[PDB]
């Protein structure tokens, strides 16, 4: 009756095998006090953002549209170079899809009323998971990459801010201190 | 896959560390199993991945050791012009600028994409054993008993080449000399 | 003043509230909207809430 | 000056959005003769 | 060309919906539009329902914190 | 593969891809990354034949353009000629006509998804070289897909060797030089 | 018979009843629109384009006494007085509302189920023979299909080179 990830701590009651990312790690025990469907959806959404964000840090940093305000490698300082005009029409593009995928249901008291499982916006163009085993291994892979990419954009961004150097550059230069 | 020398080498009743017993993953079937795994890496990581890594390291390091020796005994014509006199790790930095090492990385990565696919497929029950890339053009591994032995030779020489390459590279860091020059000192 | 900026937005900072606060209000309104019976009706107004 | 500007923009947008999405929330039904 | 309209005066570059780059972007837009109807159906008919497509990992699956 | 087991003949240490049964021409069981397990082999074969049919014309076009340019177009190498003709509006004519063709190409693709047309199988054989003879058609299809793959690779080569050497393919073969001035270059 | 696009199945509704039907409708306009309306539009476009092609030819070499000639036939639209063009437009409107029975919508044009293009215009009795009508229906549609393309080309290369079609052919030069 003890958490696997926190041997010393007892297992969170809510956390369970069924989740697909459970390793018993909820030391705070947020699970006990929020809809775990909402928490999983938030985890997967943040991770799906960050998984693209780290690669962006990296691709924007090497290649870039040849448009005039699109070429500025340090991503942190790039957000402002490209005009907010563009950044806003994209923000609006993500709004459309937020409401498209979530199908209007986009509040904690309404999002999952339609029976949608957390973290699924019904997207599965490739790497099909009809195989529960495949779904079972792919969900753990997705959760691990979500969790890793969180740390990533975090570091890349805070680090790009710390040394005004994009990801690949910083480490190679690695001006320390 | 019967084990050559089962009883004297690579088999039960030959447990390396006498006091301790080996992990439950280290059964009597695997090649070069002297019952040695004190830190217990085997229970965590699958044995197929571990033997894949062992064989890949051994095969890379045998080439690395023979490269570090042969590069001292002889050199391909024209390398001495582009590359100045440049031993193990300085030559790496020079050749990176030269672009040869980019080509090595590109093509060995192209091969390692299919190596990744092979590791994946073996780990999902394709029936392939670790390090088996179907490469035996001379048909020297056709006989089964000779193949058994040659597997343990491959493992042991890979281990010896790993330790050897570590030796040559750190001796170079100490003295800045190659293997042949370092031994005559 | 008299410069002709769209909605008086001379600094790009001003847009962040102007676009986001409607979006948070829109998100709160969507929870209400998704709960409604959104089929058509033949009446002067909808009596279903 | 800019701080006051953005604060006033925040306040104005907040109340205007409340008005907008409040009258859009089936205001016609909020009468005593419904049902 | 002398009498081609919708063209610039001094630049000589066609501008608007009659420019070479707008045509290029228009082909790529139709490509992006046709991608989902084409490759989604390619996925639907074939799919990864082969009953062998399965993710594989190095760690033992007895304790991967598996879903 | 040295050990017993069933494996792809292309890559002896990898399994036969599941959807590559062997009906399709040039099926050497080569799909390590398993696209066919993720996509239709029909749609993928359509894409392969389209890429090959474009790239074969591209390869022969580069060779001929280096060898010969028309009396009315200028004498510029195949790659830098692209901008010269995009301006001339020629590419905005090739693009229009190829798009007009590809409307019906896409309709035919959607009819291939419904299993009414084989991938890449327009009814194009005006000279009737292999319509009457079926085994000739199969042999010609295998040669078609081999030439498709070879021409894709050859086009990629001939463009990148130009990007480095700044020479045409015929010019490079007549006057072969190493890149980066390596006959006299250090580090 | 032979199919226009042999690698696409024949369209389901496009049966071989209308003259000049070789089973050609890849995008599928017949499925989503009434084939009678489409046939009427086809014949109307063909007829106006045949007349306009002959207009391009004759206008280049002829000009009535009350009018003055432009550099090209397409220029004759602009040297002509503007009022007469509106007279032509309203006359065509009266002809196209009177000839159609004042049924100008897709939902009512074929209430009486007349054949597409059969506006009851047949002075001189041409086509009275049952057999000649079948061939002439095919001749009409194929000539109109040709003339739409011909009118488009002649217009666009009369604007591109300010030269009539005949003078362009006698003095052709690259653009
Ligand atoms: C453009 C409009 C738009 C729209 C309509 C939505 C809609 C939504 N987003 Mg958001 N989102 C947007 C843009 C948008 N997003 C953009 C551009 C991104 C960056 C890629 C995200 C990234 C994102 C994530 C990662 C998450 C959401 C979540 C949500 C949901 C609830 C948000 C909420 O109530 O916030 C109200 C509360 C706040 C704004 C608090 C913000 C400060 C925190 C607490 C720190 C909802 C479906 C959440 C969700 O789905 O919950 C499970 C969620 O986890 N969104
Ligand atoms: C993986 C997480 C992590 C990260 C991102 C950092 C980041 C940093 N640590 Mg380290 N640090 C870590 C773990 C980490 N630490 C841990 C686990 C400990 C022990 C609790 C320390 C204890 C430590 C000390 C004592 C110092 C750093 C310092 C540094 C800096 C090193 C960069 C440089 O100058 O080169 C940077 C702020 C140095 C610093 O702050 O330099 C200004 C420094 O003196 N770190
Ligand atoms: C990356 C390694 C490398 C580099 C930088 C060069 C560079 C050069 N070679 Mg080359 N060469 C190489 C590998 C290399 N070679 C290999 C593997 C072979 C195949 C055996 C050759 C075979 C070769 C020959 C036969 C000759 C050169 C020669 C030359 C030099 C003219 C030129 C500087 C020429 C030279 O100068 O020789 C003294 C020459 O004759 N090379
Ligand atoms: C540049 C391309 C490339 C790619 C895609 C790979 C891919 C791979 N290598 Mg690597 N490798 C490469 C070049 C590359 N290699 C080169 C040039 C060498 C030098 C000879 C090596 C030497 C090498 C060794 C010695 C080993 C690998 C291993 C692996 C595998 C483990 C990957 C992993 O878990 O990473 C996780 C890390 C993420 C950051 C995978 C098949 C290991 C393997 O097969 O394990 C079973 C292994 O043992 N590689
Ligand atoms: C991928 C196909 C491709 C592309 C994109 C281009 C593009 C170009 N070619 Mg062409 N070309 C091609 C194939 C191609 N070519 C082939 C296969 C040949 C050999 C016949 C030529 C021979 C050729 C010459 C001799 C010249 C060009 C030139 C040009 C330029 C002007 C357009 C022109 O006149 O084309 C002409 C294209 C053809 C005559 C090929 C027609 C055949 C098509 C591909 C259909 C295939 C046969 C059909 C199914 C039966 C332009 C950069 C000119 C240039 O470089 O100017 C600076 C020029 O002088 N090309
Ligand atoms: C009503 C008929 C009167 C005509 C009003 C003109 C309409 C033009 C609107 C644009 C205004 C503008 O650009 O702002 C521009 C101006 C202020 O913008 C000024 O711009 C200047 C340079 O352009 C400087 O930047 C100044 O700092 C800045 O104040 O707007 C205002 O005056 C404030 C707006 C007050 C709005 C009251 C809210 C109305 C209550 C309900 C709103 C209806 C909601 C409907 C929802 C759908
Ligand atoms: C995937 C997200 C996405 C979508 C779906 C999308 C769709 C459309 C549509 C479709 C209906 C139109 C018509 C359109 C038009 C314009 N887009 Mg937009 N766009 C997206 C992304 C970006 C980015 C990243 C940028 C950008 C821009 C502009 C500009 C610039 C105007 C100017 O500044 O003069 C114009 C005119 C750039 C920008 O505004 O900054 C220079 C910019 O950086 N867009 N965009
Ligand atoms: C086929 C179409 C058609 C029809 C059925 C038709 C019928 C009638 C009727 C019958 C009710 C009358 C009474 C009438 C009278 C006049 N028509 Mg007219 N007309 C047609 C076509 C044109 C064109 C193309 C032009 C034109 C003109 C004139 C002028 C000149 C006035 C002037 O001196 O300015 C006068 C008086 C010319 C014009 O307006 O020139 C500025 C001119 O260009 N019409 N027209
Ligand atoms: C979903 C889906 C599909 C798909 C798909 C796609 C396109 C998926 C794409 C996924 C991507 C792009 C995932 C990226 C993950 C990145 C990670 C974990 C990065 C970690 C970085 C770290 C820890 C770091 C770091 C660093 C930091 C911070 C500091 C630096 O100085 C150093 C360093 C750089 C090392 C398809 C289309 C097949 C359909 C299917 O039906 C469903
Ligand atoms: C190229 C390059 C570089 C580089 C570099 C490289 C590649 C450096 C390193 C290379 C290698 C091959 C290192 C090997 C180290 C082996 C060790 C310490 C062995 C320990 C053995 C033990 C504990 C024995 C254990 C035992 C044994 C066998 C027998 C007894 C029992 C037991 C106790 C179990 C840089 C970094 C300079 C940068 C430069 O820009 C480019
Ligand atoms: C600021 C800025 C600049 C340019 C763009 C823009 C103006 C919009 C603006 C954008 C800012 C953005 C996007 C900021 C985002 C912030 C991010 C991604 C922060 C991430 C922080 C992550 C952190 C701490 C992670 C620390 C994690 C730790 C210890 C984990 C510890 C551990 C745990 C939990 C369990 C296992 C054991 C281990 C590994 C020790
Ligand atoms: C300019 C002017 C002057 C005075 C009056 C006014 C101001 C109104 C104005 C009038 C403008 C008018 C009347 C414009 C009319 C435009 C016309 C008729 C445009 C015609 C465009 C035609 C085009 C593209 C045809 C291209 C057809 C193609 C490839 C067909 C493809 C093919 C098909 C379908 C089957 C067989 C194979 C083949 C040949 C490949």
Automatic annotation (TrEMBL), chain D:
<comment type="similarity">
    <text>Belongs to the PsbI family.</text>
</comment>
<dbReference type="GO" id="GO:0015979">
    <property type="term" value="P:photosynthesis"/>
</dbReference>
<keyword id="KW-0674">Reaction center</keyword>
<dbReference type="GO" id="GO:0005737">
    <property type="term" value="C:cytoplasm"/>
</dbReference>
<keyword id="KW-1133">Transmembrane helix</keyword>
<keyword id="KW-0793">Thylakoid</keyword>
<dbReference type="Pfam" id="PF02532">
    <property type="entry name" value="PsbI"/>
</dbReference>
<dbReference type="GO" id="GO:0042651">
    <property type="term" value="C:thylakoid membrane"/>
</dbReference>
<keyword id="KW-0934">Plastid</keyword>
<feature type="transmembrane region" description="Helical">
    <location>
        <begin position="6"/>
        <end position="25"/>
    </location>
</feature>
<dbReference type="GO" id="GO:0009539">
    <property type="term" value="C:photosystem II reaction center"/>
</dbReference>
<keyword id="KW-0472">Membrane</keyword>
<dbReference type="InterPro" id="IPR037271">
    <property type="entry name" value="PSII_PsbI_sf"/>
</dbReference>
<keyword id="KW-0602">Photosynthesis</keyword>
<keyword id="KW-0150">Chloroplast</keyword>
<keyword id="KW-0604">Photosystem II</keyword>
<comment type="function">
    <text>One of the components of the core complex of photosystem II (PSII), required for its stability and/or assembly. PSII is a light-driven water:plastoquinone oxidoreductase that uses light energy to abstract electrons from H(2)O, generating O(2) and a proton gradient subsequently used for ATP formation. It consists of a core antenna complex that captures photons, and an electron transfer chain that converts photonic excitation into a charge separation.</text>
</comment>
<keyword id="KW-0812">Transmembrane</keyword>
<dbReference type="InterPro" id="IPR003686">
    <property type="entry name" value="PSII_PsbI"/>
</dbReference>
<comment type="subunit">
    <text>PSII is composed of 1 copy each of membrane proteins PsbA, PsbB, PsbC, PsbD, PsbE, PsbF, PsbH, PsbI, PsbJ, PsbK, PsbL, PsbM, PsbT, PsbX, PsbY, PsbZ, Psb30/Ycf12, at least 3 peripheral proteins of the oxygen-evolving complex and a large number of cofactors. It forms dimeric complexes.</text>
</comment>
<protein>
    <recommendedName>
        <fullName>Photosystem II reaction center protein I</fullName>
    </recommendedName>
</protein>
């Amino acid at each position: 009756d003890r958490s696997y990830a926190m041997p010393f701590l007892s297992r969170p009651p809510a956390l369970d095998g069924s989740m697909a990312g459970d390793v018993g790690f909820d030391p705070l025990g947020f699970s006990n006090y929020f809809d775990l469907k909402w928490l999983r959806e938030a985890e997967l959404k943040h991770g799906r953002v960050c998984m693209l964000g780290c690669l962006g840090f990296l691709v924007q940093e090497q290649a870039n549209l040849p448009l005039p305000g699109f070429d500025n490698k340090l991503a942190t300082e790039a957000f402002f170079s490209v005009p907010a005009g563009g950044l806003w029409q994209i923000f609006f593009s993500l709004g459309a899809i937020e409401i498209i995928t979530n199908k209007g249901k986009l509040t904690p008291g309404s999002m999952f009323t339609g029976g949608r499982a957390p973290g699924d916006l019904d997207f599965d163009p490739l790497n099909l998971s009809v195989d529960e085993t495949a779904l079972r291994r792919f969900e753990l892979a997705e959760l691990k990459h979500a969790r890793l990419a969180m740390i990533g954009l975090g570091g890349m961004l805070h680090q790009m801010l710390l040394t005004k150097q994009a990801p690949i550059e910083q480490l190679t230069n690695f001006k320390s201190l | 896959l019967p084990l050559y020398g089962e009883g004297k080498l690579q088999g039960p009743g030959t447990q390396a560390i006498p006091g301790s017993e080996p992990p439950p993953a280290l059964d009597g079937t695997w090649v070069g199993d002297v019952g040695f795994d004190p830190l217990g890496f085997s229970r965590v990581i699958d044995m197929r991945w571990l033997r894949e890594a062992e064989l890949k390291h051994g095969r890379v390091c045998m080439l690395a050791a023979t490269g570090m020796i042969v590069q001292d005994i002889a050199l391909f014509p024209g390398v001495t012009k582009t590359f100045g006199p440049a031993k193990i790790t300085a030559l790496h930095d020079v050749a990176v600028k030269q672009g040869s090492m980019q080509q090595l990385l590109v093509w060995l990565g192209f091969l390692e994409i299919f190596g990744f696919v092979a590791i994946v497929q073996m780990l999902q029950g394709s029936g392939r054993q670790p390090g088996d890339f179907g490469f035996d053009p001379l048909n020297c591994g056709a006989n089964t008993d000779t193949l058994a032995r040659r597997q343990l030779v491959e493992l042991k020489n890979g281990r010896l080449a790993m330790i050897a390459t570590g030796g040559m590279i750190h001796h170079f860091f100490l003295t800045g000399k190659g293997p042949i020059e370092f031994i005559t000192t | 003043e008299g410069t002709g900026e769209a909605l008086g937005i001379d600094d790009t900072r001003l847009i962040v509230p102007v676009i986001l606060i409607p979006v948070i209000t829109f998100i709160l309104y969507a929870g209400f909207a998704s709960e409604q019976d959104n089929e058509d009706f033949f009446d002067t107004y909808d009596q279903r809430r | 000056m800019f701080t006051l500007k953005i604060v006033v923009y925040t306040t104005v947008t907040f109340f205007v959005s409340l008005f907008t999405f409040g009258f859009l929330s089936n205001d016609a039904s909020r009468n005593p003769n419904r049902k | 060309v002398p009498n081609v309209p919708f063209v610039d005066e001094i630049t000589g570059e066609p501008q608007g919906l009659t420019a070479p780059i707008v045509h290029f972007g228009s082909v790529i837009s139709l490509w992006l539009l046709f991608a989902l109807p084409v490759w989604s159906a390619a996925y639907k008919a074939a799919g990864a329902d082969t009953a062998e497509w399965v993710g594989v990992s190095q760690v033992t699956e007895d304790a991967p914190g598996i879903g | 593969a040295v050990f017993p087991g069933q494996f792809s003949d292309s890559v002896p240490f990898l399994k036969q891809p599941t959807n590559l049964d062997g009906s399709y021409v040039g099926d050497v069981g080569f799909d390590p990354l398993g696209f066919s397990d993720v996509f239709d082999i029909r749609v993928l074969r359509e894409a392969e034949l389209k890429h090959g049919r474009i790239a074969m014309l591209a390869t022969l076009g580069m060779v001929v353009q280096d060898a010969y340019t028309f009396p009315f177009f200028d004498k510029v190498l195949p790659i830098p000629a692209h901008d010269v003709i995009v301006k001339s509006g020629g590419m905005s004519q090739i693009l229009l006509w190829t798009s007009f063709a590809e409307i019906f190409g896409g309709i035919a693709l959607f009819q291939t998804i419904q299993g009414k047309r084989a991938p890449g199988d327009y009814s194009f054989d005006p000279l009737n070289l292999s319509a009457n003879d079926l085994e000739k058609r199969e042999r010609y299809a295998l040669a078609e897909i081999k030439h498709s793959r070879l021409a894709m690779l050859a086009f990629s080569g001939m463009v990148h060797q130009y990007f480095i050497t700044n020479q045409g393919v015929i010019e490079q073969i007549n006057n072969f030089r190493p890149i980066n001035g390596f006959p006299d270059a250090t580090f | 018979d032979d199919l226009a696009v042999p690698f696409l199945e024949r369209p389901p509704m496009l049966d071989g009843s209308y003259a000049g039907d070789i089973g050609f409708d890849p995008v599928g306009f017949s499925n989503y629109f009434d084939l009678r309306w489409l046939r009427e539009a086809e014949l109307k476009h063909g007829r106006v384009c045949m007349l306009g092609v002959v207009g391009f030819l004759v206008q280049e070499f002829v000009t009535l006494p009350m009018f003055s000639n432009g550099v090209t036939p397409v220029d004759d639209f602009f040297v002509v007085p503007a009022t007469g063009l509106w007279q032509i437009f309203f006359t065509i409107g009266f002809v196209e509302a009177f000839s159609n029975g004042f049924k100008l919508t897709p939902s009512d044009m074929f209430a009486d189920d007349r054949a597409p293009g059969d506006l009851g215009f047949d002075p001189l009795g041409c086509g009275k023979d049952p057999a000649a009508l079948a061939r002439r229906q095919l001749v009409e549609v194929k000539n109109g299909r040709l003339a739409m393309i011909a009118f488009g080309g002649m217009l666009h290369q009369q604007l591109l080179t300010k030269q009539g079609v005949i003078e362009q052919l006698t003095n052709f030069k690259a653009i």
